[PDB]
Design a binder for these strands. Structure first.
Lengths: 54, 207, 122, 119, 114
RNA sequence: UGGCACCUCGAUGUCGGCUCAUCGCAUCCUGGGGCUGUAGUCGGUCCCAAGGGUUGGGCUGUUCGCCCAUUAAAGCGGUACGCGAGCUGGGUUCAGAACGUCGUGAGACAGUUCGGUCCCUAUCCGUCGCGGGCGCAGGAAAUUUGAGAGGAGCUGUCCUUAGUACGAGAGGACCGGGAUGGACGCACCGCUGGUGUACCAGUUGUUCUGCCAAGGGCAUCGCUGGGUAGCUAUGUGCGGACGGGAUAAGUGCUGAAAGCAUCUAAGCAUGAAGCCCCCCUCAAGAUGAGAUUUCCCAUUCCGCAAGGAAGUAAGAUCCCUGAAAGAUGAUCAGGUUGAUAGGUCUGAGGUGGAAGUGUGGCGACACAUGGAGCUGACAGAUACUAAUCGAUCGAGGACUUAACC
């Protein structure tokens, strides 16, 4: 229940390969496009199917 | 040999001529169309492909529509092979219906069982519990892991893991009634799989 | 379902009143007995005047059980009492009369000298 | 099935009651996405009871709709508003009186938010 | 489950009278003892009516020789000759499980008739 | 069992139970044989065989043993008591408190009652499941062969053959047919049940909706009687069948060396629950990377050169609605030429006779509705609400060489 030996740098760096985050799924709005999220109402001018709700 | 495939509907009962109740399972069948033929010289063995339950155009790509061009039918959802058949009496594009089975024939049925997810040792492998009193601290957990001498664990130890959802075969099942107008089969017993699955119905090969 | 250490009262005029089971015959690990079976059992409470006494190990046949008995046509039978009669080697009973209804899932075996002397064979 | 929303069976009922009573008064709310998705069903069921318009109906709805004032200068109970205005407003639609519109996450805990309103 | 209905429509029976869980009746079953076929009569009270298709089942409880005996049947079995109804019953539930331990004159249901 | 003493380390914790097991054969049962002081029925003894199987309790003692009732049988041994970072210190293991026998005495061995409170969030190798990369020498969508691996492998009665063979008699068959069981395994919810905390109904106390009637909160889901879907066994269905090839111990055919003989030295046969197939499952990362069918076309720029960039085609993914799937990824059904979820209608099922209004009531209540007002996971219709617009990836057949062409 206690590590037998210390961990080197190669093993640490190898294990961290999948610890990362991806880009968001985003697209611009037809009116005053501001590169909002897909299937969401934008907060400045990404007017979802009409007016810009917020 | 012989066989077709369809879906599965549910379960019910049937009173026989001797006023005896027997459980029953319902198979949907519907006509099956032969799509290809494999020969010993060209492919190395002998078989026929089957098609069933066509789908609408938007749900098929171009290779799929090209493949069924020869049989002259619409694209189909399910396709699988069936080996050991008499290679004559079968042409590409021919129809195969439920009449190939008689009332009293014997059959094997193959499917895929329902999933159960991550299950433990007691349910997955049917092991025993420990006592639940008398100062015991061992209830539902896997047993010891072998001797001390090998310095390792053998290959074949049984542990929890994902359970169910594999391929199973049940043999020696009778047929009760054949309903050609609606394309129905009435087996006797149970069959692996959830509702609306794919079930293979092949003639019995002894055991 | 009958197992070891199951109180079960006799339903005939042999002398016993109450009888506890010891073992279920047949098989090499059989745990339960359902109906129309044989068991070796002792006598715990007995009538003073009779042929059988306390502490004696004998053989018996199950007649009634709270758990039912399925039938081929799909119908069921069930009771509210566990009862047995005494027999000896040949299935002829020790007693002369049997009290209460007797399940007919006892017909398939050779138990005729039992069915005969009993009312409501159901 | 349904969702438990991280509460016991007795607080879930109270929270659903509070939300369905506030939606009637304010005509649009903003909560999490899961709360809105689990709320739309109950709110639609309540509207239909009102559309019927009887005494049994009135009494059934009464045993769920919280009693808060819905319009000042009119001493209008929320139940009276439900049986007066909305029933005439949606007298011709056959189901579907709600719509959910998503927004961005929340700063405090990253929860996704949504606005649910009456249409 | 419609397909099952069209499959099993034919074997349903169109003869039985209508009865309720609290109700005394008398059934006419056929027993094929050996080669002879004799009609035996069962008489008792209704206890349960859980069904739903071709697969309904009603239980009837009676008492004979001091021992309570129950019998369960399927409704549409073709071993039933006919079903009668002798008396009606004023009861307040659909599952009369309290009639098991209760005995004596604590039993006996009120009769409705007319 | 001793003798003797090599790794004693912050120790060489030794024996019985629990959970999981594996190996040997010097065989307890089941299969095949040779001799008998083997008429049969039953035996005795000796060979070949390790595939499967090999039990529930009482007595105090943790141990050893004695008993009761079954079964085809209740086999011997190794794995650091096989297994304490898996349980029970149970008894080794202390001691600490007390209770006879020897000490001048301090005390030392009594036999017995009480105690030990005992700990650990898994780094590496091992095991059991699930993903992401790249490779397989154009790019893609499907269907598959099987080098190799795993699983399974057990037995009792009864009826015939036939009261026949044998045997004064009693007794009582081999070989072969037919039913029906025990233990074990795999699937499933139509039936009998279990649970079923957003389903139905009765009821106690105290509060609240201004009052009456009708309702909400709290009291283990307040308590009690039933129960849909899903999950389940004690429930239901099915399995271990029939055969091939080479053999072990055995039984043999012709046949010499050795004019005879002889299972063998030439040669040719038969012969087991062992062995290799037959049955079920996984399987081309089998770098030896396999096979068949169908699509897309050989664009545009730099670089004499190999090569390097950019838009694409067939085809996918991001994103959204979900469950026959699920820890999360993954898998599967769909994205407005759509029934994928919710709602609205019409049903199936469960509980069972609502409220309001009469009528009869001193009243406590009853009768006229409904066999419906009430209904969460279950069906059929219906675009009423939500699955919009878009974005990213993806080939010009690498490279020759010979034969063929």
């Amino acid at each position: 229940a206690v590590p037998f030996r210390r961990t080197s740098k190669m093993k640490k760096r190898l294990r961290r390969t999948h610890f990362k985050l991806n880009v968001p799924g985003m697209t611009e709005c037809p009116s005053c496009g501001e590169m909002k999220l897909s299937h969401r109402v934008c907060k400045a001018c990404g007017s979802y199917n009409g007016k810009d709700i917020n | 040999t012989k066989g077709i495939l369809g879906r599965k509907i549910g379960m019910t009962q049937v009173f026989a001529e001797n006023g005896d109740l027997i459980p029953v399972t319902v198979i949907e069948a519907a006509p099956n169309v032969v799509l290809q033929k494999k020969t010993a010289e060209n492919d190395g063995y002998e078989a026929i492909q089957l098609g069933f339950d066509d789908k609408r155009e938007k749900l098929s790509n171009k290779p799929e529509k090209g493949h069924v061009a020869k049989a002259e039918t619409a694209p189909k959802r399910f396709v699988k092979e069936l080996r050991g058949v008499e290679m004559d009496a079968y042409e590409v594009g021919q129809e195969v219906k439920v009449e190939i089975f008689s009332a009293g024939e014997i059959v094997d049925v193959t499917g895929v069982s329902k999933g159960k997810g991550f299950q433990g040792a007691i349910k997955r492998h049917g092991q025993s519990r420990g006592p639940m009193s008398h100062g015991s601290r061992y209830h539902r957990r896997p047993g010891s892991m072998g001797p001390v001498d090998p310095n390792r664990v053998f290959k074949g130890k049984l542990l929890p893991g994902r359970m169910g959802g594999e391929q199973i075969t049940v043999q020696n099942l009778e047929i009760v009634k054949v309903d050609a107008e609606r394309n129905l089969l009435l087996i006797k017993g149970n069959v692996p799989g959830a509702k609306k699955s794919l079930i293979t119905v092949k003639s019995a090969v002894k055991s | 379902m009958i197992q070891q250490e199951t109180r079960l009262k006799v339903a005939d005029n042999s002398g016993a009143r109450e009888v506890l089971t010891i073992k279920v015959l047949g098989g090499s690990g059989r745990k339960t007995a359902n109906i129309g079976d044989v068991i070796v059992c002792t006598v715990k409470q007995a009538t003073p005047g009779g042929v059988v006494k306390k502490g004696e190990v004998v053989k018996a046949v199950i007649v009634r059980t709270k758990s039912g008995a399925r039938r081929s046509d799909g119908s069921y039978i069930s009771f509210d009492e566990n009862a047995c009669v005494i027999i000896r080697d040949d299935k002829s009973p020790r007693g002369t009369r049997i009290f209460g209804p007797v399940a007919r899932e006892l017909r398939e075996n050779n138990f005729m000298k039992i069915v005969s002397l009993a009312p409501e064979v159901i | 099935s349904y969702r438990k929303l991280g509460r016991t069976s007795a607080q879930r009922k109270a929270m659903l009651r509070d939300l369905t009573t506030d939606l009637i008064i304010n005509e649009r709310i903003e909560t999490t996405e899961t709360r809105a998705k689990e709320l739309r069903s109950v709110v639609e069921k309540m509207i239909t009871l009102g559309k019927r318009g009887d005494l049994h109906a009135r009494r059934q709805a009464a045993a769920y709709i919280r009693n808060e004032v819905a319009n000042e200068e009119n001493n209008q109970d929320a139940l009276q508003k439900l049986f007066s205005d909305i029933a005439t407003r949606y007298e011709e639609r056959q189901g579907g009186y709600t719509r959910i519109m998503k927004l961005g996450p929340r700063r405090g805990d990253g929860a996704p938010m949504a606005i649910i309103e009456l249409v | 489950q419609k397909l099952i209905e069209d499959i099993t429509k034919e074997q349903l029976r169109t003869d039985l009278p209508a009865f309720r869980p609290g109700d005394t009746l008398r059934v006419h079953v056929k027993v094929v003892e050996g080669n002879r076929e004799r009609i035996q009569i069962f008489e008792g009270v209704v206890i349960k009516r859980r069904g739903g298709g071709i697969s309904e089942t009603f239980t009837v409880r009676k008492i004979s020789y001091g021992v309570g005996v129950e019998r369960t049947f399927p409704v549409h079995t073709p071993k039933i000759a006919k079903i009668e109804v002798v008396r009606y019953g004023k009861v307040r539930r659909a599952k009369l499980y309290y009639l098991r331990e209760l005995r004596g004159k604590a039993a006996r249901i009120k009769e409705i008739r007319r």
